[PDB]
Amino acid sequence: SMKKEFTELYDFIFDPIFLVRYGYYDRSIKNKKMNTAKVELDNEYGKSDSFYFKVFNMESFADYLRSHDLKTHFNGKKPLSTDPVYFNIPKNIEARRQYKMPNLYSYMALNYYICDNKKEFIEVFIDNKFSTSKFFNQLNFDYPKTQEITQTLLYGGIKKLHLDLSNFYHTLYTHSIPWMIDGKSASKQKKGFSNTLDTLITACQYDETHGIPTGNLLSRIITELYMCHFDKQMEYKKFVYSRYVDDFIFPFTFENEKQEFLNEFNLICRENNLIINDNKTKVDNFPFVDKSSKSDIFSFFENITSTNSNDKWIKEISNFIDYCVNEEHLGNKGAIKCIFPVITNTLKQKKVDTKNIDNIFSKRNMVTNFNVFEKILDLSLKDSRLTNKFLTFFENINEFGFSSLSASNIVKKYFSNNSKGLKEKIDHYRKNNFNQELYQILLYMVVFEIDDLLNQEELLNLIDLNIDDYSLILGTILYLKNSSYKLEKLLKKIDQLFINTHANYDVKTSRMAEKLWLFRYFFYFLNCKNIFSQKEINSYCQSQNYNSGQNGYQTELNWNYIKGQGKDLRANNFFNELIVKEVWLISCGENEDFKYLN
Amino acid sequence: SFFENITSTNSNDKWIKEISNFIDYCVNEEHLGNKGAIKCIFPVITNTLKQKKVDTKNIDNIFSKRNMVTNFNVFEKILDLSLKDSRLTNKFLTFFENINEFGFSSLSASNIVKKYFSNNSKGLKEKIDHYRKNNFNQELYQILLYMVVF
Amino acid sequence: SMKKEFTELYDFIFDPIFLVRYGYYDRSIKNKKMNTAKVELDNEYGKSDSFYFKVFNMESFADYLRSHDLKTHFNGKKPLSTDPVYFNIPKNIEARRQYKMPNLYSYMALNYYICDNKKEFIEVFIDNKFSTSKFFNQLNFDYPKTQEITQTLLYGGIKKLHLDLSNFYHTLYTHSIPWMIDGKSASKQKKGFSNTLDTLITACQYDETHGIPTGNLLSRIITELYMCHFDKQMEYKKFVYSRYVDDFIFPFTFENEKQEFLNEFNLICRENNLIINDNKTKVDNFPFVDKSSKSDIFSFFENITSTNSNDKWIKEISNFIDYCVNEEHLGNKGAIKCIFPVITNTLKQKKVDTKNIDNIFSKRNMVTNFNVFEKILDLSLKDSRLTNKFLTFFENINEFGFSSLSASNIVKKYFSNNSKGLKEKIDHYRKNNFNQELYQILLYMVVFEIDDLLNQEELLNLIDLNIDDYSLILGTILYLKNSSYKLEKLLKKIDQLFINTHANYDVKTSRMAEKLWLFRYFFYFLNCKNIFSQKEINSYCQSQNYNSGQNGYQTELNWNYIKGQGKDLRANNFFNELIVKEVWLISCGENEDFKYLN
Amino acid sequence: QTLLYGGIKKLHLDLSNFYHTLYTHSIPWMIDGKSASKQKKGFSNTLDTLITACQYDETHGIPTGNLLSRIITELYMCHFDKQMEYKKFVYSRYVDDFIFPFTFENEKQEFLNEFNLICRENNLIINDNKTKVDNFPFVDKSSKSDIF
DNA sequence: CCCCCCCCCCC
DNA sequence: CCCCCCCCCCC
DNA sequence: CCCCCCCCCCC
DNA sequence: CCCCCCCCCCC
DNA sequence: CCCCCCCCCCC
């Protein structure tokens, strides 16, 4: 039954371990058996578009949860307020979009509350008919199935009205969530489900009521609940439409239907402080335009075989990249995303031999200096949202036989040829807080062993304020990967950053409820396993004249002393429990020395 | 040449999705100014089904299958396409005649059209009233002819 | 000196009595001597665009303040939370804009706090150089002077960049006010000036942190402080521009200047959760376009004299209206606003005799049935933001000699000819909460003695939920103006409304901290002076079987019983102090019988 | 494609009527420096003399339609390229079709100023109609895959 | 995971 | 035509 | 020339 | 207010 | 109809 498929999917999804192991970084899996009871390191079952799993993942945390219960940390009535990792990404070539990756403690508080009240979500989701977003790309509810549902919903209509909400996630008033769930006139008399949910959301973003912490699956689930209650209001008024998150497709024939729909939709938006993006409002008349047909794209390679020469494969792949970039320019949404999966699947399906793949992607044409890996790398650097897809593509063809040393040399050569523009780019994103672009550049330098772009001085200039946690981690990794440099300068930079960050806070505020919680955990976890040698930390702190004590040297660099400071130590106790059990949140590679090339 | 790389060895699900994408593609072609593209949908689907040499029971499965999760059926999509333009009534009924000869059961088609009409009864009654007041003869004719036939 | 003119203006403005007498309804006066120490009723010195002064004004309250001190009501640390009057107005022919007229108690709390900390505002305003909005159209800082300042600020630039903030007032995060004033990294540790200011603002909108309560002068002053601190940040980075509220005019010559400005402006907007309206972004190249020249408009009437016939005056005025409507269509902002003042000033300056004015505006052409007052009335009904300008124009020409009975008959005839469309309009705005349009129609019916449009049944359908206070007052006035109808049905409607409104609240919430505070004050003030006869209220409440008691009949209609209910009675005590002293907030006319035709 | 790496935007520039209005005495300017035209007998001066002899001592334009003209024009344009490379710019040129890859508007403006300066020095005129910036995702209208 | 056909939307 | 203000729309 | 894959840009 | 020239921007 | 390749335009 339809109901029973929905129920299976939602009992899979609404599990705390699922919700952190794939939810935190917004990962999707296509089969329940992918959710193995072991730590996954060498492969990736998941599909994600934000963060590189081989460096940043929740596998160790999920393994910890699988055997030990952290319910006890999450019984205090008032949820602890914490600062998230602010991580700004491109919306397009011009605009920006803000992610907020919550403190893991606040994430887990919200996570257990949502799984404890999962029926609040599941009854509405299963009763809902208009949402194609209430599957969250999980299991087998992929893009063609959601388009099938949308097509069914658009029956009978000679016209389509398209409506969008402007800046929906990022300006959503969080106290309007209980209005949508329970009725606005019942907000005026807490202790209910929706009020507590709002409180935990604001705790995830430091009691900020402006917007929802975007970039994770719990936020998507809460937003979907909000929007399915919007859908319930519109359905009680007897309207039929398709919604993907905030993209409303209204089928209609007569203008009175359209006008009555617009009045009702305007009314609910005004009641809940929602704003329509009037730029995106458009009526499409039949015959309907469809710019997102992907048939030509996935059938680019029909007439090429493994009997074709490696040169024809190279030129065909190059033409493919140009063709999909042009398709995306023309309005074919997701065409650039399609380049990497379909190249990989064509290489697998045409059954090209490993040594032929090595020749295809490692060949440098002598006259033209052209190499097709370099073209694909430059394409990925054109949009930092493509970082994960590019690195997954590299992983796949490296498995297919493309040598990792050859890839490292190609990326090194690319970076040397473009070093000046790349340094100007790094400076641009550092001044303007373009977090994902800087992250992409540093992650490529970490992955492909680029040690020539930035010297010691620029690397230490990376460790400063207005740098996101992930970039701080990647720069610190770049610095530790170079054995020539000595650790005192990094210790000084990190200490300065920690003190300056704590200076923005009440002196009774715990460190792990503050900004840079993830970098701090990285540091304390490294120090706990002597990559950050305890002797040289002692030397640095002697140089700084810190007073010793019962726990140690009374510095921001000493977790033994830090874990006990602050009035509320709940986040500190949670992260100390993680540190003692050797739960890592940042993967240091197979051999603990920060190499990700396999 | 939409259907060059599909064969009778392809699964019925791929045939369903390929036909759906075909309909969307020709509707977009007609929107872009390709005159007669929507007319082309029915003859070339029928000729592809004949030429790919798909078996009668496979045709029955292709056009009678209701996907349980999505409630999608490809005959219902083609029927709704035909109701989008009443000049398509004859082409739709000829297409139904052809695939019914190809093996698609007439009782299954009747149930599919009945279900479509029940789900859209309110809008269809408003449509009937519209064409009755405004003398839209072919639209009313198409609706009543579907009710007679199915 | 420049400083000393600024100082004079700001010591005039930052006075509590000024800030309520002209600030509450956003009124401007051109001379300090207009701020008389008496109640103004028959004339209006002020200039306002929102609410009709002859019905809604603060003159009685200001007279009360002038002799008695209400500081004592405003010493409790935690400000009482209240609901404002929600009053939605057209933004244009399509979009809407929300006003929130605060509870007078919360207004006065904010008012005294701001005047007590006026130096916080005045130092920044006087030090500011980029704002042409920091004069609030007061005294002699009118439109040409602000344009003079803007012109000076735009010197040296071959290009202008225009930037706007989208939905600035209505989506402003109120906790970002202390960020702008003090620095965002100092929000994390209250008791300071900016935090208390934020708290009083949210108290004005029922502890809602989404947006600023728009439609009054205190909101404009707070928004100007916010924006002048934005200007201080941009000036420290050595940029020069003109700002009107959120309209940024950046003068520049080279594209590097423009790009650096855009990066800095984007950075501050991202820091303070401000969103640029990317639709309004445009660069203008010299030679510069100027679509707002008003020279032809104010010189339409140069070649007409009082020796011209009344027919030529009629036709000239008609052509004038068409010409300014076309000017506004072409992008001449404020051209339609210009119609009424310049017609009035032309009639005064051409020195047309009173009987000639009567003939001009009262003449009905027999063949064409055309009357120029009816055309101007229909123009005003085309945009409800024109209500005040139309009624001021009528007041002026009525003073010039145009008979009020003739105007009443003309408006009556108009309303009879268009009764069907007008009833459909009334229903439209009632279903869709178009508050200002409904207000305009009911205010015309009140002013011009229209008693034929709506019978008793529709008038009682006016008294229901989702109707703003001002429309509720105007409908109740329409009902009391008709002596044929008896008062029991209105008493039943009003009682139902009061009970239903209190049902949305905690049972310990005081009535005058709730929605419909202004309607409730209207009712209680009428009952206190026996327009709402006490005998017939007793009869109604006997019919409803209310239990009597120490104060009276224990109903929502009895202020004696109502004033003592609720845990916090501060708002009730303040409004009871107003009621006892016969301070009215709604003018009932010269002879207390609700006639405004003079 | 290799030359256009690293760029989020492309600037397209063309020279108007390049072959047919090329001042032939500007060839020694491009090859040797304009301030060295004022004191012949050198390579570039003799080359200019033979070109004008091919078109009846006409100094307006280059005799178009043969490979020697293409070689001389390519020498001229590669010296233009040497001037732009010494100022540390990277672009693709086909004859007179300049494809400038860039990311920030300051790069584009500095390139435009330098290019304008050299064009003014050598009596070269930009076809302002063909000037356009393309933003990524880039348009490509010349795919021949369906055709072949 | 298992054992042809895939691959895209949003915030 | 008579005795200021005019003057244009359509088919 | 020799022995699959080609084929187009400019002036 | 008092005693020529005015009149418009925003939210 | 018979025995590969079809299939569209208009009024």
Numbering used by the authors:
A (entry chain A), C (entry chain E): 0 to 188, 191 to 599
B (entry chain F): 300 to 449
D (entry chain C): 150 to 188, 191 to 299
Could you share sentences copied from the article?
Abortive infection (Abi) is a bacterial antiphage defense strategy involving suicide of the infected cell. Some Abi pathways involve polymerases that are related to reverse transcriptases. They are unique in the way they combine the ability to synthesize DNA in a template-independent manner with protein priming. Here, we report crystal and cryo-electron microscopy structures of two Abi polymerases: AbiK and Abi-P2. Both proteins adopt a bilobal structure with an RT-like domain that comprises palm and fingers subdomains and a unique helical domain.
The structure of Ll-AbiK was determined by single-particle cryo-EM at 2.3 Å resolution. The Ll-AbiK hexamer is composed of two trimers that are stacked back-to-back, with the palm subdomains facing inward. In line with D3 symmetry of the hexamer, the two trimers are rotated relative to each other by 60° around a central three-fold axis of the trimer. The arrangement of the subunits creates a spherical cavity in the central part of hexamer with a diameter of ∼40 Å. Similarly, in the cryo-EM reconstruction two separate fragments of the DNA product can be seen—three nucleotides of the 5′ portion of the DNA, including the terminal nucleotide that is covalently attached to the protein, and eight nucleotides of the 3′ fragment that are accommodated within the channel. This implies that the region connecting these fragments is mobile or the DNA length could vary among individual molecules. In the cryo-EM structure of Ll-AbiK a clearly defined density of a 3′ nucleotide connected to the rest of the DNA is visible at the active site. The position of this nucleotide corresponds to the pre-translocation product state in which the last residue of the DNA occupies the position of the incoming nucleotide in substrate state. However, the position of the 3′ terminal nucleotide of the pre-translocation state captured in the Ll-AbiK-DNA structure is identical to the position of the incoming nucleotide in RNA/DNA complexes of the maturase and HIV-1 RT, reflecting the conservation of active site architecture.
